[PDB]
Amino acid sequence: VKLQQSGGGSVQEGGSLRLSCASSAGPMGWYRRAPGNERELVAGISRNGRTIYAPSLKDRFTISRDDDNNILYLQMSDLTPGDTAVYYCNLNVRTAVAGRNDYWGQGTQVTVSS
């Protein structure tokens, strides 16, 4: 299993991005890590679609999963440099044959220019 990410990069302040994470099931989540800081959960989604957000990010970030195409998305709006970070998707599964597995995307740099 591999998670492949897209949709980030440089973006002007006030702009918006839609990150994608394609798993080439289980709960998934988006995390971010800014330079010199620890990882933080931005949003997660259960197999059945229940969502959880970092309280302070809920108003600008939305997580969704496309089950027809197998794509996880993070819509992020009204950005500032406070949102500059590497963003990572995660898929954490528990199956019958293999047991537990934990998969991460390669990371997507988002750089908001002010």
Numbering used by the authors: 2 to 25, 31 to 120
Copy out sentences from the published article reporting this entry, exactly as the authors wrote them.
Dali homology searching had previously located a similar secondary structure within the Ebolavirus genus NP, two of the three alpha helices being identified as forming a dorsal “V”-like shelf and a much smaller, shallower basin, well upstream of the C-terminus. X-ray diffraction was then used to solve crystal structures of sdAb–antigen complexes and unbound sdAbs. In our present study, we show the consequences of this FR interfacing in recontouring the sdAb surface to be more accommodating to undulating and convex antigenic landscapes, bypassing the need for a concave epitope.
We coexpressed the His6 tag–deficient sdAb with KIHis6-tagged NP C-termini in the E. coli periplasm to form antibody–antigen complexes in vivo and also used periplasmic expression to produce the His6-tagged sdAb alone to obtain the unbound forms of the antibodies.
